[PDB]
Amino acid sequence: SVLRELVTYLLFLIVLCILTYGMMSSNVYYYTRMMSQLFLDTPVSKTEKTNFKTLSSMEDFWKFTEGSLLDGLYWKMDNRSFIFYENLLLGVPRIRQLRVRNGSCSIPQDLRDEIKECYDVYSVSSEDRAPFGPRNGTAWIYTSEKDLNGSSHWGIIATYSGAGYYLDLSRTREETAAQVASLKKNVWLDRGTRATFIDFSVYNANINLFCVVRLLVEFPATGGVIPSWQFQPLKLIRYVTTFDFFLAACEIIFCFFIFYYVVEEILEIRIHKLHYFRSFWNCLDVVIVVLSVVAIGINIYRTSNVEVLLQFLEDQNTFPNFEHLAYWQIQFNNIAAVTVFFVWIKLFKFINFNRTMSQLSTTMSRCAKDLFGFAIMFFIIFLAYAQLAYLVFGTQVDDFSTFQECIFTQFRIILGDINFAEIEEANRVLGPIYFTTFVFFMFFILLNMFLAIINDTYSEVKSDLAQQ
Amino acid sequence: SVLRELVTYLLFLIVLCILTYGMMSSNVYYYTRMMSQLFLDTPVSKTEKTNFKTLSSMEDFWKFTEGSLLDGLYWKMADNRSFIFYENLLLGVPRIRQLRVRNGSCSIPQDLRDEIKECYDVYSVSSEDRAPFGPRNGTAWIYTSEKDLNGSSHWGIIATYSGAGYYLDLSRTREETAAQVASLKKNVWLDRGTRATFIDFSVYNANINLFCVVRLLVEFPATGGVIPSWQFQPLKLIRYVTTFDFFLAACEIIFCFFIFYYVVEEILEIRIHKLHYFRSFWNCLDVVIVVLSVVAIGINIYRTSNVEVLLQFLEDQNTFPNFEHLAYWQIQFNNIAAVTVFFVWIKLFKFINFNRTMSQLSTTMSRCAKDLFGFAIMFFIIFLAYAQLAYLVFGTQVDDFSTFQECIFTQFRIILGDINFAEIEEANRVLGPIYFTTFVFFMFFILLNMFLAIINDTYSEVKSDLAQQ
Amino acid sequence: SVLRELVTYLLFLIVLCILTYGMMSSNVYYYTRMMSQLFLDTPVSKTEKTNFKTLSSMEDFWKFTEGSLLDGLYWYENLLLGVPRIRQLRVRNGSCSIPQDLRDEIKECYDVYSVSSEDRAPFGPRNGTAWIYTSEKDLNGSSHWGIIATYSGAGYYLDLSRTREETAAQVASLKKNVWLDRGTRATFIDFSVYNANINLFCVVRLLVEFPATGGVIPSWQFQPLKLIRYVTTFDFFLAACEIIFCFFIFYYVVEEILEIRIHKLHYFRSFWNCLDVVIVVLSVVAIGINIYRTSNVEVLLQFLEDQNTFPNFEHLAYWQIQFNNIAAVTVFFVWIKLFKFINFNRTMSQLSTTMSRCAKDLFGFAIMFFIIFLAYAQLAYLVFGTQVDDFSTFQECIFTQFRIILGDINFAEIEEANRVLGPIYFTTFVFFMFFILLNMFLAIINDTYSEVKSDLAQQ
Ligand SMILES: *[C@@H]1O[C@H](CO)[C@@H](O)[C@H](O)[C@H]1NC(C)=O
Ligand SMILES: *[C@@H]1O[C@H](CO)[C@@H](O)[C@H](O)[C@H]1NC(C)=O
Ligand SMILES: *[C@@H]1O[C@H](CO)[C@@H](O)[C@H](O)[C@H]1NC(C)=O
Ligand SMILES: *[C@@H]1O[C@H](CO)[C@@H](O)[C@H](O)[C@H]1NC(C)=O
Ligand SMILES: *[C@@H]1O[C@H](CO)[C@@H](O)[C@H](O)[C@H]1NC(C)=O
Ligand SMILES: *[C@@H]1O[C@H](CO)[C@@H](O)[C@H](O)[C@H]1NC(C)=O
Ligand SMILES: *[C@@H]1O[C@H](CO)[C@@H](O)[C@H](O)[C@H]1NC(C)=O
Ligand SMILES: *[C@H]1O[C@H](CO)[C@@H](O)[C@H](O)[C@H]1NC(C)=O
Ligand SMILES: [Ca+2]
Ligand SMILES: [Ca+2]
Numbered sequence A: 001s002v003l004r005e006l007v008t009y010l011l012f013l014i015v016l017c018i019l020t021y022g023m024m025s026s027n028v029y030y031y032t033r034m035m036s037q038l039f040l041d042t043p044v045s046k047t048e049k050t051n052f053k054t055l056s057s058m059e060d061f062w063k064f065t066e067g068s069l070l071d072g073l074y075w076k077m078d079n080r081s082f083i084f085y086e087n088l089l090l091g092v093p094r095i096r097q098l099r100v101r102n103g104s105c106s107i108p109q110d111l112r113d114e115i116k117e118c119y120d121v122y123s124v125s126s127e128d129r130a131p132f133g134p135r136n137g138t139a140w141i142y143t144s145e146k147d148l149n150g151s152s153h154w155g156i157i158a159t160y161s162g163a164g165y166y167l168d169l170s171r172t173r174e175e176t177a178a179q180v181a182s183l184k185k186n187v188w189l190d191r192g193t194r195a196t197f198i199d200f201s202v203y204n205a206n207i208n209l210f211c212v213v214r215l216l217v218e219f220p221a222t223g224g225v226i227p228s229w230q231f232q233p234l235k236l237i238r239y240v241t242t243f244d245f246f247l248a249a250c251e252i253i254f255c256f257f258i259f260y261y262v263v264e265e266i267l268e269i270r271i272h273k274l275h276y277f278r279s280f281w282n283c284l285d286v287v288i289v290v291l292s293v294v295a296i297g298i299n300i301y302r303t304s305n306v307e308v309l310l311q312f313l314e315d316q317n318t319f320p321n322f323e324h325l326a327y328w329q330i331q332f333n334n335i336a337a338v339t340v341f342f343v344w345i346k347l348f349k350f351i352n353f354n355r356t357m358s359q360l361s362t363t364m365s366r367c368a369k370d371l372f373g374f375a376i377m378f379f380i381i382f383l384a385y386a387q388l389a390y391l392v393f394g395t396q397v398d399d400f401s402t403f404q405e406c407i408f409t410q411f412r413i414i415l416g417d418i419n420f421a422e423i424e425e426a427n428r429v430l431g432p433i434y435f436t437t438f439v440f441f442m443f444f445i446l447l448n449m450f451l452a453i454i455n456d457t458y459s460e461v462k463s464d465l466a467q468q
Numbered sequence B: 001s002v003l004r005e006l007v008t009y010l011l012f013l014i015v016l017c018i019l020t021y022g023m024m025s026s027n028v029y030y031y032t033r034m035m036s037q038l039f040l041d042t043p044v045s046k047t048e049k050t051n052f053k054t055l056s057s058m059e060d061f062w063k064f065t066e067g068s069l070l071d072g073l074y075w076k077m078a079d080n081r082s083f084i085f086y087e088n089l090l091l092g093v094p095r096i097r098q099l100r101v102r103n104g105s106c107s108i109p110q111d112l113r114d115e116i117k118e119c120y121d122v123y124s125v126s127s128e129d130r131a132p133f134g135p136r137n138g139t140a141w142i143y144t145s146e147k148d149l150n151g152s153s154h155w156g157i158i159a160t161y162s163g164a165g166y167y168l169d170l171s172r173t174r175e176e177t178a179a180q181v182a183s184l185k186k187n188v189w190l191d192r193g194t195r196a197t198f199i200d201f202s203v204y205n206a207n208i209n210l211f212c213v214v215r216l217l218v219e220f221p222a223t224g225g226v227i228p229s230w231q232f233q234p235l236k237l238i239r240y241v242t243t244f245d246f247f248l249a250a251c252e253i254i255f256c257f258f259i260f261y262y263v264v265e266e267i268l269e270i271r272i273h274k275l276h277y278f279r280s281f282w283n284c285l286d287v288v289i290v291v292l293s294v295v296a297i298g299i300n301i302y303r304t305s306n307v308e309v310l311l312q313f314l315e316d317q318n319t320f321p322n323f324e325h326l327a328y329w330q331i332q333f334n335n336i337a338a339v340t341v342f343f344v345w346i347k348l349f350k351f352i353n354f355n356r357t358m359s360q361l362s363t364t365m366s367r368c369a370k371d372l373f374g375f376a377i378m379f380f381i382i383f384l385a386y387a388q389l390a391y392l393v394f395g396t397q398v399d400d401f402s403t404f405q406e407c408i409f410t411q412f413r414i415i416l417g418d419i420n421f422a423e424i425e426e427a428n429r430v431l432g433p434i435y436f437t438t439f440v441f442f443m444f445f446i447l448l449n450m451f452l453a454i455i456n457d458t459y460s461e462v463k464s465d466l467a468q469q
Numbered sequence C: 001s002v003l004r005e006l007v008t009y010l011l012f013l014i015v016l017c018i019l020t021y022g023m024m025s026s027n028v029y030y031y032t033r034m035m036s037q038l039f040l041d042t043p044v045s046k047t048e049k050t051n052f053k054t055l056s057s058m059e060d061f062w063k064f065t066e067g068s069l070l071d072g073l074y075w076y077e078n079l080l081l082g083v084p085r086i087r088q089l090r091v092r093n094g095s096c097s098i099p100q101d102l103r104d105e106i107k108e109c110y111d112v113y114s115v116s117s118e119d120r121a122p123f124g125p126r127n128g129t130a131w132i133y134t135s136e137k138d139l140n141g142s143s144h145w146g147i148i149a150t151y152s153g154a155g156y157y158l159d160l161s162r163t164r165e166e167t168a169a170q171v172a173s174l175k176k177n178v179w180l181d182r183g184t185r186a187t188f189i190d191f192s193v194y195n196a197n198i199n200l201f202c203v204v205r206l207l208v209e210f211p212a213t214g215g216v217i218p219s220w221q222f223q224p225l226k227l228i229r230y231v232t233t234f235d236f237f238l239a240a241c242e243i244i245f246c247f248f249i250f251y252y253v254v255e256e257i258l259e260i261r262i263h264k265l266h267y268f269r270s271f272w273n274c275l276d277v278v279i280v281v282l283s284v285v286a287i288g289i290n291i292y293r294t295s296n297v298e299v300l301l302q303f304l305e306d307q308n309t310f311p312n313f314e315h316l317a318y319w320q321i322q323f324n325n326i327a328a329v330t331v332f333f334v335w336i337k338l339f340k341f342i343n344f345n346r347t348m349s350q351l352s353t354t355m356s357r358c359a360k361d362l363f364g365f366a367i368m369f370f371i372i373f374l375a376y377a378q379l380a381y382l383v384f385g386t387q388v389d390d391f392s393t394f395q396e397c398i399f400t401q402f403r404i405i406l407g408d409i410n411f412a413e414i415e416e417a418n419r420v421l422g423p424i425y426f427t428t429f430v431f432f433m434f435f436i437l438l439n440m441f442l443a444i445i446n447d448t449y450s451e452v453k454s455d456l457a458q459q
Helices: A002-022 A031-041 A060-064 A068-073 A174-186 A241-270 A280-304 A307-314 A323-349 A355-366 A368-393 A403-415 A431-467 B002-023 B028-040 B059-067 B068-073 B174-186 B244-271 B282-302 B308-315 B323-349 B354-392 B404-416 B422-424 B433-468 C002-024 C027-041 C058-064 C164-176 C234-264 C271-296 C314-340 C348-356 C359-384 C395-404 C412-417 C423-458
Strands: A096-097 A165-168 A193-203 A212-219 A227-235 B094-100 B166-169 B192-204 B212-220 B227-235 C087-089 C157-160 C186-193 C201-209 C217-223
Touching: A002 A241, A002 A323, A031 A068, A031 A212, A031 A227, A060 A174, A060 A193, A096 B059, A212 A323, A241 A280, A280 A323, A280 B354, A307 C157, A323 C087, A323 C359, A355 A368, A355 C359, A368 A403, A368 A431, A368 B323, A368 B354, A403 A431, A403 C423, A431 B404, A431 B433, A431 C423, B002 B174, B002 B244, B002 B323, B028 B068, B028 B212, B028 B227, B059 B068, B059 B174, B068 B174, B192 C395, B227 B323, B244 B282, B282 B323, B308 B422, B354 B433, B404 B433, B422 C423, C002 C201, C002 C234, C002 C314, C027 C201, C027 C217, C087 C395, C157 C412, C201 C314, C217 C314, C271 C314, C348 C359, C348 C423, C359 C395, C412 C423
Parallel strands: none
Antiparallel strands: A096 A165, A096 A193, A193 A212, A212 A227, B094 B166, B094 B192, B192 B212, B212 B227, C087 C157, C087 C186, C186 C201, C201 C217
C-alpha cells in the first residue's frame, strides 16, 4: 500500500537531513567573520579612518596595499605566517590588473583639439595587450588567460576575463613591501587601469577547512573606485575522522536512493501511463531527480580534480590556485539547497490522514489556477510600475540603479522599508505620485482581490463537498 | 482581426523597449554619484564636520565657497585645464549669482518705528533690488537683466527666482578664483538683504560621450536660516558618434512612423464608425498615449534642433557654457517618456483573454470598478479631513506636516508603518495619540475591509452567474 | 450563579493588577543600564577607542583586565561584596588529528571545546591554584550555555583582592607569566556590587570565548536583586497583597480539586479548565521561586561588612530571571481568562461559537504552514549560513523569518552574500506569505462565521 512509499520517503528525508547537517559544520561563520573584520574594517593607516569598504581613489588603494593588507597578511610568532596564530598562510598572494588601451574610443572632432586620450569601458574586444613602463618583468607584460589558469569573475560594473598583468608577492613582509613600493614608483595604475584583484588562501589546521580570499577593485571610466570582497571556506582533506566516513556512507546511500527513484520513474514513463505529465507530483519528482543527478555530477567532477592542491604540496613557495574549487563549491551548495527545499515540499503528498487535511488540500489545489491567472495581472502591473520607477529614479537614488534592484525595492516598499526622503527630492513631481498610487493600488485593490479569490474558492469547495 | 492588432502592438512595444533600454546606457548612476559625493559629502574644511547638505549660516556658505568647492573644482595634472577625476574636463569657467531685495520694502508699525529702522521683505519681482551697491566696480555690483543674462526661472523650494541678479564669472585656475572670492568676501557681498545664491558649471568626461551640468542653490529666507539644494544632470549633445547611435536614430524614426499610423487609425475609427467612441476606456487610453507621444516628439524635435549654445561655447572656450535650458527640457522629456512607457505597458490588458479564467477576472474588475469609485470618494474625503487636521495641528512643529501634500504623503507612510510616533506625541501630548490611534483603527478596521467586502461580493456574484448560466 | 465567579475573579484581577503595578516601577532597569554603561561602554584605555563590546584579540582582553575593569570597579560608587573570581577553561595539545598530507609544517592542533578534549595537566609555574586543574565539585558551579559551546564549571581559577594595588599586581603577574596560551578556550569573570546609594544588589558575570579559528567573542550579564524589608507602609501594603494572592491561589486550587474530583472522567474537552490549571501551576511555581529567594536572601548580607571570600550567587540570578519570565505569561493568561465572562449577549455568543467551531481547521492548516516555514528556513540556513549572522544557526533562521513576517528585513547582507538565490528567496518568501498563505487562515474563519449565522436561520 502507501506505507511502502511513505517509509521510503521518510528514509530519504532522514538521510538528506543528515547530509545537510554534516555539510554545515557548526560555527564556520565566525571564521569568515574574523577574517573579513581583519581585512575589511581596519583603517588603512593610523592617521585616517578609511578602510577597504570606503575606498574612494587610487591613492587610498595604494595606502591599503602598503598598509592594513601587509599588517594583516604577515604575522610574527623564512618563517611561515599564522594569521591568528592558527590560520597558516599558504604560498604567496597574487596581485593582478586588467587595463584598456589608449584610443579605444573616438573623440568627436569638435573637441578633438583639447582632449587627446580617451579610454573605453572594459570589454574583451578593447583591452590592452602591449608592454608598458619598465618592460622587464611579469607585471609589465600581458599574459593570456590560458597561460594564467584563470576564468571570468562577473564583477559589478562588468565581467572581467582571467588574463592581465600579474605579480606574485613574497613570503615575508620585507620583500612584499619592496615589491609593492617598486610597483608604485614606476607608475603601474594609470588612467587605463580598469580592474585589480588580490588573491590568497589560509588553512587553519585546527579544523580541516581552507579559506580562499579574493579582493576586487573596479575603476570605472567616469572616475572613482568600487570595492568588493569574497571569503569562501572549503574542505579538501575530507577523510580524516569517523564522521567523514559516516558522511561518505550517507552519500553512497543517497546515490542508491537516487538510482532507485530514477529507475522507478523510467519504468513508470516507459510503458505504463504514457505522457503522465498531467500530475503535479510527477513533475515534482522529475525536478527532484534532475537536480539530484546534477548535484551528484558536480560533486564527482569537483571531488576528483584536486590536482592543484596535490601540486601545491610539492612546491610550497608558489601561488595556490583554488578559485575553480570555490566556484564549484558555491554552485553545489546552491543546487543542494534547492533540492532540499523541494524534497521537503514533497511531504504534502502524504498528509491526508483525516477529513480536515484532505479538505484543506482540495481547496489549496482548486484555487491554483485562478491564483496563477491573477498573478499574471499582478506581475504585469508590478513590472509596469518597476519600469516607470527605473526610468524616473534610475540615476539618483541607488535603490533604482538596475531593473532587478527596482523590483526588489518595490517588494521592500510593501514591508515599509524605504526612505522616501530620497524619492521626493530626486523628483518633486512624479515622485510622490508614483509612491502614493503604488501604495493605494497594492494595499487596497490587489491584496483584497487575492483574499476574495481564496475566500470564494474555499467556501465553494467546502459547500459542494458537504453537499455531495 | 485581433491577430493584426496584437502583432502591431508587440512591434510597438519592442521598439519602445529598445528606446528605453538605449536611453539608459552604461551606468551613468556612478557618474552622477561620484560628483555628488565630491561636492556634497565633503566637509567644508578639515576641523569642522559641516558640508553643503548641512549648511546653517552665511559664514558656513563662505567657508564652503573657499573650501571644498575650490578643492573639487580645480585639480592638478601653462594655464592647463582641470580634469576633475583625471577624466572629467571642466568646461569654461563656473559662474556665481545672487538675488537680493530692497531696503525698506516692508511696512513696520508706527509703534516700533524707533527700535527698528531697516526691514527687508520676502523675495518677489516687485520687491527685488536693481540698484548698484557697495564698491560699484564690475558686473558683481551692477544689476543685470534676465534678457541680457539669458536666464530663466528656477522654482526653488521657498519661491520661484528670476534669471536676473548680480553675477560674477570665475577663472580657469584656482589662484585667481580664490583671489576673486576673497575680494567678494572682504567687500560685503552677502548682506541680510540677500535672498538667493546660485553656482553653475559643467563637465564633459570624453570617455563616455556625456556632459554633466551642475547647479547648486542656497536660499536665505526672510525669517533667517539657510536652505541648500542641488542638481546634477547628465546630457548627450554629440549623439551620432557610434553605430549604436545610428541604430537608435533609426528606431526613433520607426517610432514616429508607428505613432503616425496609430493616429491615422484613431482618426479612421472616430470619423464615422461609433461616433460616440468614448465609452470604452480603451479609446481614452489610446488617445492619451497618442497625446503623450506627440508631445514627447515635439519636445525632442524642439530640443535637439536648438544647440547653438554648444557651437557658441566651442567658438571660444574661455566663457561660461549656458546649458540649463537643455537640462530642463531633458528632465521634461524624461518624465513624459516614463509616463508614456507606463501607459503603453498598461495597455497590454486588452489582449489577455485567452481562456475562461482571465475573462472572469477582467469581468469582475470591470463590474466592481463603478462601486470602488463610489466608495473611494468617501475614503478620500475622510483622508483629506485627517490630512487637514494634521496640517493645522502639527504643521508648525513636526516638519513632516509642514505642507498639505507632505501631510498626505505622511499619512500614506503611516499606512505602511514608516512613521515615528514619538515625534508627534511630543508635539501635542493630547490630540496626537488620539489622531494616531483613530487613524490607524479606522483605516485598518473599517475602510480597508469595505473594499474587500465589495470585491468579494462582486467576484462571487460574477462567478456564480457564469456557473449557473 | 456565575455572579460569584465574576466578582471573585474581578477581585483576583485587581489584586494581580496592583501587584504588577508595584513591580512595574521598581526602577531596576535604569540602574542596571547605567551600570552596564560603566563597564561595556568606556574605552579600554585612554588611547584605544575599543570597549568590552568590541573586543577583537587577546591583547584587547589583557588591556581590559588592566584598565577599564580595574578603574571602574574600585572607585555609581558601589562597593564590593567580596573578591571577584577569574576562571579559565582550556583544551589539551594534540586533541585532533593533523592530516598526513601537510604535517611537516604544522606540529600542534587544538580542537574545539569539549569534555573529551579538556586539559587537566598543571601548566606554567606550578605555584598556586591558577596553574592547576580543580574539579567542578570544589568550585560549586554549573554549565553556562555560551554562544559557541556549553562550558563546565571546572577550570583554572583565581580569586582577586579587595585592594586595587594588589589585584593589579596579581593580574600583572598573570600577564607576565603567560596564562592565555593557544589552548585557552573560555574565560569567566564574576563579582557582585551593592551601591549603597540606592539599595539594589547586583551580580555581574562576563565571558570571553576564544574560538578555534582565532579571535574573541564577548558576552555579559548583569542581574539585580533586592533585600526587601518592612521599612515603610507601602511595602506592607504589597506584603498584604502577596498574602491575599496566596489565599486566592489556594482557593482556586482547592475548588479546582473539587471540580476535578466530581468530573474526573472527562476534564480536558473544555478549554477553560486547561487555562485555569496552567494559571494555577504557573502561580504556584512563581510563588515557590519567590519564597526560596526571600528565604535565601538572608545569607548575602554576611559578606557586606567584610569577607575575603567569593560569593557564588548565580542561582539567585537565574531563578529571578525565571520568575520574571513566569510572571509575564501569568498576567497574560490571567488577562485571557477575562474572555470567558464577556459572552453575555447573543452577538457575543455567535462570535464565541464561530471561534470555537473553527479551532480544528486552524490547527490543521498550522501544520502545512509550519512545513512550508521549515522548508524555507532550511533553505535560508543552507544558503546564508556562513555569511549573514542572522542565519548562523537554525533557530536564528527561524526567528529571522518570523521577524520578516512582521516587517524587519535588512536585505543588504542578504543581497551581498548571494547576488542570485538571495533576492529570489526574499521575493518568493514575501510573495507567498503576504498574498497566499496567511490569507488562508482568515478564509477558514470567514466560512465558519457564515455557516454559524446560516444555522440561526434554520433554528
Ligand atoms: C594616446 O593616443 C593619442 C593618439 O591616439 C596620443 O596623442 C596620446 O599621446 C596617447 N597617450 C599616451 C599617454 O601615450
Ligand atoms: C627592470 O629589469 C630588472 C628586473 O628584471 C630590474 O633589475 C631593473 O632595475 C628594472 N628596471 C627599472 C626598474 O627601471
Ligand atoms: C598554470 O598551471 C600549470 C600547471 O598545469 C603551471 O605549470 C603554471 O605555472 C600555471 N600558471 C601560472 C601559475 O601562472
Ligand atoms: C534702510 O532704510 C532706512 C530708512 O527707511 C534707513 O534708516 C536705514 O539706514 C537703511 N539701511 C541701510 C541703508 O542699510
Ligand atoms: C575696484 O577696482 C579697482 C581697480 O580695478 C581696485 O583697485 C579696487 O580695489 C576695487 N575695489 C574697491 C575700490 O572697493
Ligand atoms: C604538541 O604535541 C606535539 C606532539 O607531536 C609536539 O610535537 C608539540 O611540540 C606540542 N606542542 C608544544 C607547544 O609543545
Ligand atoms: C612562582 O614562584 C613564586 C612562588 O614561590 C612566586 O613568588 C613567583 O612570583 C612565581 N613566578 C615566577 C617565579 O616566575
Ligand atoms: C565552595 O564551598 C565549599 C564547601 O564545601 C568550600 O570548601 C569551597 O571553598 C567553596 N568554593 C571554593 C573557593 O572552592
Ligand atoms: Ca511519481
Ligand atoms: Ca482603439
